[PDB]
Design a protein around this nucleic acid. Structure first.
Lengths: 86, 106, 656, 95, 98, 93, 105, 98, 81
DNA sequence: TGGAGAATCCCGGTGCCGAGGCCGCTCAATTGGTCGTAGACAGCTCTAGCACCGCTTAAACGCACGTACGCGCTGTCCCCCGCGTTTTAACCGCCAAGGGGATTACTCCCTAGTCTCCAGGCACGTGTCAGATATATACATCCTGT
DNA sequence: ACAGGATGTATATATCTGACACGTGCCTGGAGACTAGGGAGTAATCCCCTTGGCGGTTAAAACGCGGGGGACAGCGCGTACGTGCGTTTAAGCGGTGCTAGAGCTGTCTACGACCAATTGAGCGGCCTCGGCACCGGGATTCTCCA
């Protein structure tokens, strides 16, 4: 009902999702106040890679974020990701 | 009309590698033996990961190598793992790892 | 196909064709098409094969073998267009020979692409001949409490005479003329002949409910199979049909369910339907799609289209309709027309504007005419009145400064941007908001921000916190959430939910409108008799206005929305035609226009008029019969010199 | 005109050299077109330092043979150096 | 009816999700998060449809590489549940909150 | 016998910031290492940036991208206003 | 002969950077206006650590900049520290930092 | 005589050694360790006299960067002493014994 | 007589953690860190020889140790280069 | 205390879509000279590094002790797993535009390349001064008793 | 709890002292001019791919409730490690000597840039048949309560 207008998307990573996510990484039982902290952790992770991959594309004199720049932005941290054209 | 990789008797294309070291600005001069030696070591490396994948996909009886088999292959061997420790694989997932204290009644 | 005749048809083409007609068939640029015809005349294909664009001067396919490569395939598929049209010519005359076997008149020309059999008053007066297949009387298995009109008597035997000839039919009458009422009657006429199914009706979820209403209403003997629910529910439905404990004549599904599940795909393939009825088969308009193959893969001895659109001048539509009506050509390869259909239209080229193709669009329409039964409104006439309303100063005072807030000083002055945007400032124009806002100024003027501008919503904000509406800190968000709602709605959250009632009523400003005091005339069109009316309204807030314009004069009971699209509605539509307790049921543009209601509600009123012919007539023929007992008249509301009048056609005509 | 280079057919090749009975999904093949491209990126980046460190302008076989001991771990590099000095020997006698 | 033992359903989801490989955050909540931080950083930006896909598996393999790591600290404190001091230990050692 | 460094230039800046401050030659070796790390780490990015978009040239724009990329933002904010201020003095010559 | 750094208004030898940026194989071609921009960010960065150093050497009541002043300069800053996160230093040691549970009961 | 409280002398050595900057492993035991692993790796090798000096501060700043880190785990288990499972946690997170 | 790995002596690591700010140590730590230090050297002194191996020198220089520690990720200043 | 009951592995079957082969093709690897210089080597040196070797003393080594912390046990309850009902919002598909993307043609200007020049910067040589260090010296802080 | 001795710490001055700082010759590296020529602007194009909208599903979140289990907490207890003394020992200082060898100049040369034409290997595309996903049926198996 137009009450989030691009604000509460950090709540889009829902509490069952990180519940689901730690099951793959093998955490057995989660305490209830974890979900707000990893919301901040994930966002400060994205606030590097979006910060970098914009700066590539803004150097590329164009506005669409392409694919390989993300890999090049992820190289700048030292987290190489495969299977996306490089 | 024999290729230099054919004159190597090998299967990674040694010509464009020698072209890649020209325009990659890695040095000013490339020796004759340098891309020959480099295509060999890619032929050893890209097989060695792929050899472990083909034995991995045989376990689930899949002819198509799915990258889940591939990521399971690399991290299982401990020596190849240290080559790619800071690397993830697309659609990769993780190895079967549950710590023993999480298991039920002994 | 003849390759030696193929290479001659490109030789006569290339020497003759203009520059735009070269690019319209080939898709190439304007410079290469000129450079091709700069070297022409061509005595042979080899004289065309030496055309190459020259190498760039000092400051991977040649132009010859490319253009002769495609146009040879163009002339290949053109003969397949002919191989479909000439085959469509065969079964087309047999319909006309079947129609002339009735002794019935056709007011339609074959170049219209339609047949139009209006009525049989010459068969009503002198009798039915012994050699005619026409059935003048409605079928006995149909409900005798529902009268089928004489043009509706035609279409069920128009379907039946097409059913005999082993074809696929297109009942392309305009919608609202009882196309749904004929196919139920055609199912009842099939019931008379011991042809009791199984039939399929693929009708979308917006019209899954009108059929199931009229299945009980028009032929209650007809066994209906609802193939709808969850996936595991329809699995129980699939087990209900695979274990044949109950035979059905009719199965109802959507376009959604029929194609996306393999389980339904193997199910419907394992039903082997006799008649399949395609209610708004617009996927049949696009041949190059996965859905169109999914539409035609399900077997049917008789395939019927129900859509009020005539056959347009588009060969991507027409060829997609040629494989439909002609049997054993969907089973053919059809590999020569994928080249025809893959040229995407562009600023430079289009396949519909080709000279040889344009002659074939006329040629395809000429043979698809006895397959398309379209009767117009004015050929079976619901006297039309177009009653312009007088102006009111309340509507006018926001209409006349809407020559200032609409006219932004940006077109016919330039803002500073990054690059030379010569036409992006043109492409930010023709925004659809201000046209429909001018089409809302002509509407009920209360929907605009004329009542509670800025400050009355602050009083709502403090006096909605005194409720369970109490979040963390939301005194300036809920108010901003209340700043974008309309003034009918900011009345409708303070009357439906009594949290603040100091300014719920504004001296009843819904009665202060030019369209409601003319509806107060139409209200007095409902006081001399039992004139239960049909009141169409294009907008939902207009419906939220018009639900409460009845909260003043005569009582409002049921807002007949078009948002009942889940299951069959009866209780919105059955308990009607009493004196004044149930008088005004407000129809809408979003309602299902395929089906109709009972014909006693004569005066059908349109609050808003249309822009395109997709709902210019659907809101206007719900009480359109040829057997009505009293005076019947369609109404639409037009204002003084609004663009709601200017979407109605008054500019000029043509003399040709 | 549009064209793009890869390594896919050569990887698809080296598969059939060691396993005739295996298929590759195209998303899996794109790993190896990246994985061999990362490995080729790193070893060249090693020699560029190494050629700069002895202030040479060339890259011979010795720089890469230095590099593959330097980058890869031991036993994998232990076959790998022998996988090259055998291979340039076949390049040595040929022509 | 019958209720399972607590934890034992959760342990089943470990072996269900370690053997599976699909993405674990819904695409559209992940995408609408990305564009929000985009025009915060610089506006008027569009994305390739595969560009967010790699961006997802960047974060997801990072979050598994945190969660599998922060499980080791909660074991080390002789517990079986993670707490926000456990993940606070994780980035401090890894090189964020040093 | 011949070796080259930055030791006069470091000290230079030093005296044009802190004119009343000595510096040990070990501390000079830190700075001459510190210059040849930052200059090393920048030019690796400017190579790769032009390598990604296939520009054969290294210009002022790519270094401006890398300084926004490599160094963090408030350090990037002054630096991007430094060289642009520096090249504008270079421009009118 | 007006020196390039003086027409740039700096101290770092832009000719030396321009000589190094050719032979460092970072491209096959380098713009003339490129290494003037590199000289400024270098002279900014070498100033910014050193200004924080001379603050710390002032607190130790000495004139000589010593490596103990350097490591205490870089770690005490936050934003500079993330640039030199994995970077060690010579003779520097570690910032004084007591954890909370280290004090006696 | 007078004996101090235990730990309180140790706490004094924290503030003595955090403010000081000299090397903390004797040179000749460090050097004779280096040459042993040298000819294990390849023999006949000599060293520059400053080459072991940087090699010392490589290891020493690495060992402080481990010990200051492994102190954080022993705090996290509500103890004040490190145990060989604490340092075993440290390299597992850092990227050695993963 | 003595092991050179036991040349890294138990008072030294005790003195070392005081720089790192550890209050009290277990006695089993002294035989764990000796493993940690020696596995650390067998990476870097592996890399330190291989540069000199490439330069065909029989002496190790200080500048190679930095070029060893550079690709370790443990880059170190204050020694040239 | 085994028996029920949810999840599982096995499999027949469908089928589908996509990896995979055939073919054209194209441009770029290969061949072939030809130039020149970058590196290989031969030589030398001097220097830096190895090694003796004796002195010495700080620090390592060893040891009691005690005490605190660590590990364990019990307890407690608070919290979160587990399922059920609701609902929502994601997924999905389509249908749009449409503006950003990639390409080409075209020029240009700017930057490599060469030469000359000449001083900016370097190796080395002095010197003095900050600074390291004794040492009184007063002063802070923890230790334990009354 | 406060006193206070004991212990530690900055102050402050005094005396080396070598390391930093300037200074001076010198040269080579950098600045200026000039020119090619090509790399990049750029503006046009066009086509694609993005995105915004809508609908319609439904798996999925989400809310709640319960219960029981893990976390904290307190206790105890005992161990192994701080802490100081005394003793050993070797690290380091500072000489001594030697010598490989690291680094340097010098000389060819041999290998690789270069451009040209060569010519086929690869790559874009298009089929097509079969691995794989489903899927439902079917036997097996663990897990909870006796």
């Amino acid at each position: 009902r137009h009450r989030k207008v691009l604000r509460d998307n950090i709540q889009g990573i829902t509490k069952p999702a990180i519940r689901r996510l730690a099951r793959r990484g093998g955490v057995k039982r989660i305490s209830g106040l974890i979900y707000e902290e990893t919301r901040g952790v994930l966002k400060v992770f994205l606030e590097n890679v979006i910060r970098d991959a914009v700066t590539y594309t803004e150097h590329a004199k164009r506005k669409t974020v392409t694919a390989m720049d993300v890999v090049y932005a992820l190289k700048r941290q030292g987290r190489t990701l495969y299977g996306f054209g490089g | 009309a024999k290729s230099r990789s054919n004159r190597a008797g090998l299967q990674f294309p040694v010509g464009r590698i020698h072209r890649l070291l020209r325009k990659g600005n890695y040095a000013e001069r490339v020796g004759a033996g340098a891309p020959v030696y480099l295509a060999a070591v890619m032929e050893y490396l890209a097989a060695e990961v792929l050899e472990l994948a083909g034995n991995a996909a045989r376990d689930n009886k899949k002819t198509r190598i799915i990258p889940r088999h591939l990521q399971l292959a690399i991290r299982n061997d401990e020596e190849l793992n240290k080559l790619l420790s800071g690397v993830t694989i697309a659609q990769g997932g993780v190895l079967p790892n549950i710590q023993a204290v999480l298991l039920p009644k002994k | 196909i003849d390759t030696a005749a193929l290479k001659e048809e490109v030789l006569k083409y290339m020497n003759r064709c203009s520059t735009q007609d070269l690019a319209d068939m080939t898709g190439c640029t304007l410079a290469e098409a000129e450079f091709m015809v700069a070297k022409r005349p061509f005595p042979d294909l080899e004289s065309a094969l030496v055309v190459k664009q020259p190498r760039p001067v000092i400051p991977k396919t040649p132009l010859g073998p490319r253009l002769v490569g495609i146009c040879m395939e163009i002339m290949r598929g053109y003969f397949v267009v002919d191989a479909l049209i000439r085959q469509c010519e065969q079964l087309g005359g047999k319909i006309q020979r079947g129609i002339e076997a009735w002794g019935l008149s056709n007011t339609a020309t074959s170049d219209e692409g339609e047949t139009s059999l209006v009525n049989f008053d010459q068969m009503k007066s002198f009798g039915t001949p012994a050699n005619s297949s026409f059935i003048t009387t409605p079928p006995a298995s149909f409900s005798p409490d529902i009268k089928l009109q004489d043009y509706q008597i035609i279409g069920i035997n128009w379907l039946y005479l097409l059913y005999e000839l082993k074809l696929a039919g297109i009942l392309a009458d305009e919608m609202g003329l009882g196309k749904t009422c004929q196919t139920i009657a055609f199912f009842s006429l099939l019931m008379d002949k011991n042809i009791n199914g199984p039939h399929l009706v693929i009708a979308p979820a917006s019209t899954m409910e009108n059929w199931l209403r009229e299945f009980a209403k028009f032929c209650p003997k007809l066994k209906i199979e609802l193939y709808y629910g969850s996936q595991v529910e329809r699995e129980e439905i699939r087990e209900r049909i695979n274990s044949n404990k109950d035979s059905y004549n009719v199965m109802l599904t959507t376009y959604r369910l029929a194609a996306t599940s393999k389980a339904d795909r193997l199910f419907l393939r394992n039903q082997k339907f006799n008649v399949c009825v395609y209610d708004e088969g617009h996927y049949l308009k696009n041949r190059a799609s996965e859905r169109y193959r999914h539409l035609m893969s399900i077997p049917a001895d008789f395939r019927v289209l129900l859509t009020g659109t005539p056959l347009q001048n588009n060969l991507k539509e027409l060829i997609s309709l040629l494989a439909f009506i002609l049997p054993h050509v969907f089973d053919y390869g059809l590999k020569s027309l994928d080249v025809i259909f893959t040229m995407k239209k562009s600023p430079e080229s289009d396949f519909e504007r080709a000279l040889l193709s344009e002659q074939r669009v006329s040629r395809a329409k000429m043979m698809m005419a006895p397959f398309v039964l379209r009767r117009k409104k004015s050929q079976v006439l619901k006297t039309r009145i177009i009653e312009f309303c007088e102006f009111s100063e309340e509507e006018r005072r926001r209409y006349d400064d809407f020559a200032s807030k609409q006219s932004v000083n940006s077109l016919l002055v330039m803002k500073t941007n990054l690059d030379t945007n010569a036409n992006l400032a043109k492409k930010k124009s023709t925004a659809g908001f201000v046209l429909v806002q001018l089409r809302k100024l002509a509407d009920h003027p209360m929907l605009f921000r004329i009542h509670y501008k800025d400050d009355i919503l602050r009083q709502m904000a403090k006096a909605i916190m005194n409720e369970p509406q109490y979040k963390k800190a939301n005194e300036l968000y809920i108010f901003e959430d209340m700043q974008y709602m309309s003034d009918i709605e900011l009345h409708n959250l303070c009357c439906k939910f009594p949290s603040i009632n100091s300014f719920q009523l504004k001296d009843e400003p819904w009665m202060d409108a030019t369209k409601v005091r003319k509806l107060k005339k139409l209200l007095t069109n409902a006081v001399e008799n039992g004139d239960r009316v049909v009141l169409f309204s294009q907008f939902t807030q207009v419906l939220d206005i018009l639900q409460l314009v009845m909260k003043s004069l005569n009582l409002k009971f049921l807002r007949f929305d078009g948002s009942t699209q889940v299951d069959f509605r009866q209780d919105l539509i059955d308990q009607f035609y009493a004196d004044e307790s149930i008088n005004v049921f407000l129809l809408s543009t979003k309602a299902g226009g395929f089906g109709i209601n009972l014909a006693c509600a004569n005066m059908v009123i349109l609050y808003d008029v249309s822009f395109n012919p997709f709902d210019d007539l659907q809101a206007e023929d719900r009480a359109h019969r040829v057997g009505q007992k009293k005076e019947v008249t369609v109404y639409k509301f037009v204002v003084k010199d609004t663009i709601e009048e200017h979407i109605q056609r008054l500019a000029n005509a043509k003399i040709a | 005109r549009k064209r793009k280079e890869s390594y896919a057919i050569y990887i698809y090749k080296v598969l059939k050299q060691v396993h005739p009975d295996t298929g590759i999904s195209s998303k899996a093949m794109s790993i190896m077109n990246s994985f061999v491209n990362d490995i080729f990126e790193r070893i060249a980046a090693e020699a560029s330092r190494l050629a700069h460190y002895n202030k040479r302008s060339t890259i011979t076989s010795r720089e890469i043979q230095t590099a593959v001991r330097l980058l890869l771990p031991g036993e994998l590099a232990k076959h790998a150096v022998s996988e090259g000095t055998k291979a340039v020997t076949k390049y040595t006698s040929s022509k | 009816p019958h209720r399972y033992r607590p934890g034992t359903v959760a342990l089943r989801e470990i072996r269900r999700y370690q053997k599976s490989t699909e993405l674990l955050i819904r695409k559209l909540p992940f995408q609408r998060l990305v564009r929000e931080i985009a025009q915060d950083f610089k506006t008027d930006l569009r994305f390739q449809s595969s560009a967010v896909m790699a961006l997802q598996e960047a974060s997801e393999a990072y979050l598994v590489g945190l969660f599998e790591d922060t499980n080791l600290c909660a074991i080390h404190a002789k517990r079986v549940t993670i707490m926000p001091k456990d993940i606070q230990l994780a980035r401090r050692i890894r090189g964020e909150r040093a």
